[PDB]
Design a protein around this nucleic acid. Structure first.
Ligand SMILES: [K+]
Ligand SMILES: [K+]
Ligand SMILES: [K+]
Ligand SMILES: [K+]
Ligand SMILES: [K+]
Ligand SMILES: [K+]
Ligand SMILES: [K+]
Ligand SMILES: [K+]
Ligand SMILES: [K+]
Ligand SMILES: [K+]
Ligand SMILES: [K+]
Ligand SMILES: [K+]
Ligand SMILES: [K+]
Ligand SMILES: [K+]
Ligand SMILES: [K+]
Ligand SMILES: [K+]
Ligand SMILES: [K+]
Ligand SMILES: [Mg+2]
Ligand SMILES: [Mg+2]
Ligand SMILES: [Mg+2]
Ligand SMILES: [Mg+2]
Ligand SMILES: [Mg+2]
Ligand SMILES: [Mg+2]
Ligand SMILES: [Mg+2]
Ligand SMILES: [Mg+2]
Ligand SMILES: [Mg+2]
Ligand SMILES: [Mg+2]
Lengths: 116, 204, 116, 50, 182
RNA sequence: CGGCCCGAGGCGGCGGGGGCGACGGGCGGAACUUAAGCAUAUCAGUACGCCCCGGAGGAGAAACCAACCGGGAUUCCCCG
């Protein structure tokens, strides 16, 4: 014997196997495109944002991160995002600054949506 | 006749050489274990049956160790204030016996079981050991058996917390009847409240 | 106005999943118009009519997937209070020992009349 | 403070949002004569403990 | 090769292992009274083996009992004792390691008084295997078929020469010193 | 190498935990106050603190009372 200490013997360990499912029906959550995005914020400061800087400002659900925002906007408006900045306003809402890819016109995308 | 008549006769000779040796080996061992411990089988099978044990699925036995001697009050610096009749600190005696305290300790540790009864197994200068019988009341062997399924009904929860076991009954005075016992039968509080009531009838 | 709950009964899962996709997207359009009116009320509750049905068809399917099992999911178990689940059965409460019973069959219950 | 936890920010954000008058159409709708919302507060004389 | 000598004598064993080893030391050390000491001196191995061979021909049903949806030996302390008390047991076999020892401490005295031979045999677990149970305190022969009395009468003879009740009640046990035992 | 004994880790089904200004059960437990002062006594086996049930709870089929030409488990009401 090499070690002077007594350790617990190695014994088989099983995986779990519940006899009935604890969640028989898979329900939805807060996140899904068209629910994570709420509406755009329309101001003259924010119109300048689109004509130059190619950027659209949106209100989104507070629980969404930057990677969930990029994917949602790409699937709903069929376009290409480049970078997303975010903040939580003094009232509790989440604002996203969404910059489109350098070969897309956010005027063409804000116009089809109604933002103009 | 059977064998348990001899075992009962033997246990009435605790001073004998034989039982003095066996009582010595048990106290050395119990001193090497924890205060509350599960037992595989009863250490005294004949006394266990006298108190209601049955070798079926749903009956369990635990050994409980409690400490010997009197009671000391919880008063900071050993100071009672107030009237001089109330000044004593050391030399007091607990109101419940040590057998009853053993059942209450194991009821608190295992609150999903039902305490049935208890009996003595050993003692030395610092400790006494008791064994407690407990029933699991949701086992099907227990529930479907008319002999024991009185304890599956919910007025039997935490019996030892309410003074309903045999040792708890003795401290309330309930092993007596007649002269000397007329002021305790429902409860000591209940007889006081009945005897001190002003009943103002309509046609007084 | 808007969708009746009865007229989505009989529709397939795909025809209900596909119908929910347009309702979600339409509320994005209508929230965008609000922030940049009678229809927007009816659309919120069209979404609720459909999700009501998608869940009601899924519960009746699963509650037959387990109809004859020993262990059932806890959502599909009877509706009882915590105290009722823990009570003895009336048969269990009426059980008597063997000797006690064989004495109740001897000496039955009898009707009789006494006179003044 | 300029360095606040998100949990304190959210409870402060709600006191700001609900600090409002009764709308005037609500005064016509519900036929009210008390028109002041006495649950309002002002920053100079308040002690929001949030 | 972490260590050049052997470390096994210095292992700190778990609490449960240390207590049962020290318990066995305490019974070599103390002074054991004769009624308790007689369970520390069972029958030899040769005579035990050739009783176990006789006994397994009066062995009850093992695995026909799920297929059932003879002279046999008896088991259990309640039934054995009432047979010694009516002079029907012809041999009692008592186990050596009954954990509550007071269940059988009195039983050799009873067999002596009533005229029944007895034998203390090792491991109650083995007796259980004779009656298809896990363990048992005692077994008893009540009678045998005629081909076996040329052995039963001879086994009683070997029992009589080997089990002596008089010196059983006179001899203490224990009392063994460390340097003495080696 | 198997058996029995005494333990260890994991897996499955089932149960426990918290909540209430009353009534109910078990513990710990005052002082103001009265005594025309104040120590025993009284207030009070109360306030208050901790634990535990139920729709009621507790108690219960004599190791009882009696002293009679006798009653007969427990609880509650009238009476002294
Ligand atoms: K202790
Ligand atoms: K004081
Ligand atoms: K004082
Ligand atoms: K006083
Ligand atoms: K008593
Ligand atoms: K009395
Ligand atoms: K009157
Ligand atoms: K700031
Ligand atoms: K302020
Ligand atoms: K007190
Ligand atoms: K006082
Ligand atoms: K006082
Ligand atoms: K005073
Ligand atoms: K006083
Ligand atoms: K006095
Ligand atoms: K006093
Ligand atoms: K007093
Ligand atoms: Mg949902
Ligand atoms: Mg930021
Ligand atoms: Mg409930
Ligand atoms: Mg488990
Ligand atoms: Mg007062
Ligand atoms: Mg005074
Ligand atoms: Mg005065
Ligand atoms: Mg004074
Ligand atoms: Mg008094
Ligand atoms: Mg009751």
């Amino acid at each position: 014997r090499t070690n002077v200490h007594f350790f617990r013997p190695k014994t088989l360990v099983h995986k779990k196997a519940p006899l009935y499912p604890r969640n028989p029906i898979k329900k939805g959550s807060w996140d899904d495109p068209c629910d994570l995005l709420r509406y755009p914020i329309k101001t003259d400061e924010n119109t300048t944002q689109i004509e130059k800087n190619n950027t659209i400002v949106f209100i989104v659900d507070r629980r969404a991160s930057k990677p969930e925002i990029r994917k949602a906007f790409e699937t709903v408006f069929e376009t290409k995002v480049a970078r997303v900045n975010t903040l939580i306003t003094p009232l509790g809402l989440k604002k996203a600054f969404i910059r489109l890819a350098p070969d897309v016109q956010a005027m063409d995308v804000a116009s089809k949506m109604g933002l103009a | 006749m059977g064998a348990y008549k001899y075992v009962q006769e033997l246990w009435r000779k605790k001073q004998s050489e034989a039982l003095h040796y066996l009582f010595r080996l048990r106290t050395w061992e119990y001193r090497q274990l924890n205060a509350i411990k599960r037992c595989s089988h009863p250490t005294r099978p004949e006394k266990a049956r006298r108190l209601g044990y049955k070798a079926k699925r749903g009956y369990v036995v635990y050994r409980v160790r409690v400490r010997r001697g009197g009671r000391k009050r919880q008063c900071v610096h050993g100071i009672s204030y107030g009237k001089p009749r109330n000044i004593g600190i050391v030399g007091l005696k607990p109101s419940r016996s040590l057998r009853a305290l053993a059942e209450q300790k194991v009821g608190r540790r295992l609150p999903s079981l039902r305490v049935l009864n208890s009996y003595w197994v050993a003692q030395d200068g610092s400790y006494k050991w008791y064994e407690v019988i407990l029933i699991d009341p949701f086992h099907p062997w227990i529930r479907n058996d008319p002999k024991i399924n009185w304890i599956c009904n919910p007025v039997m929860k935490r019996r030892e917390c309410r003074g309903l076991t045999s040792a708890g009954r003795k401290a309330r005075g309930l092993h007596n009847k007649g002269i000397g016992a007329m002021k305790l039968r429902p409860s000591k509080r209940a007889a006081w409240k009945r005897n001190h009531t002003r009943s103002l009838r309509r046609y007084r | 106005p808007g969708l009746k709950a009865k007229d989505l009964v009989g529709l397939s899962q795909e025809d209900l999943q596909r119908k929910l996709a347009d309702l979600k997207r339409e509320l994005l359009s209508l929230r965008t118009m609000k922030a940049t009116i009678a229809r927007f009320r009816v659309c919120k509750k069209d979404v609720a009519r459909v999700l009501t049905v998608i869940n009601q068809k899924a519960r009746d399917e699963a509650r037959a997937a387990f109809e004859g099992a020993e262990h059932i999911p806890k959502t599909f178990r009877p509706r009882l209070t915590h105290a009722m689940r823990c009570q003895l059965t009336e048969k269990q409460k009426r059980l008597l020992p063997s000797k006690l019973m064989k004495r109740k069959l001897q000496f039955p219950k009898l009707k009789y009349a006494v006179k003044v | 403070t300029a360095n606040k936890t998100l949990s304190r920010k959210l409870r402060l954000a709600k006191k700001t949002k609900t600090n409002k008058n009764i709308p005037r159409w609500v005064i016509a709708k519900d036929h009210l004569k008390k028109t002041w919302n006495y649950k309002r507060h002002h920053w100079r004389r308040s002690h929001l403990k949030l | 090769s972490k260590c050049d000598f052997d470390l096994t004598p210095f292992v700190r064993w778990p609490r449960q292992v240390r207590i049962q080893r020290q318990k066995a030391v305490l019974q070599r050390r103390l002074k054991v009274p004769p009624t308790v000491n007689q369970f520390m001196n069972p029958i030899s191995r040769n005579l035990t083996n050739e009783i176990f061979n006789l006994a397994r021909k009066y062995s009850p049903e093992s695995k026909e009992e799920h297929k059932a949806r003879k002279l046999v030996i008896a088991s259990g302390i309640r039934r054995i004792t009432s047979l010694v008390e009516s002079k029907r047991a012809k041999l009692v076999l008592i186990a050596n390691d009954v954990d509550p020892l007071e269940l059988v401490l009195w039983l050799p005295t009873l067999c002596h008084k009533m005229g029944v031979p007895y034998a203390i045999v090792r491991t109650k677990g083995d007796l259980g295997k004779l009656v298809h149970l896990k363990k048992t305190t005692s077994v008893c022969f009540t009678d045998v078929n005629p081909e076996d009395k040329p052995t039963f009468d001879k086994i009683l003879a070997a029992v009589a020469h080997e089990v002596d009740y008089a010196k059983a009640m006179k001899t203490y046990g224990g009392g063994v010193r460390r340097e003495d035992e080696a």
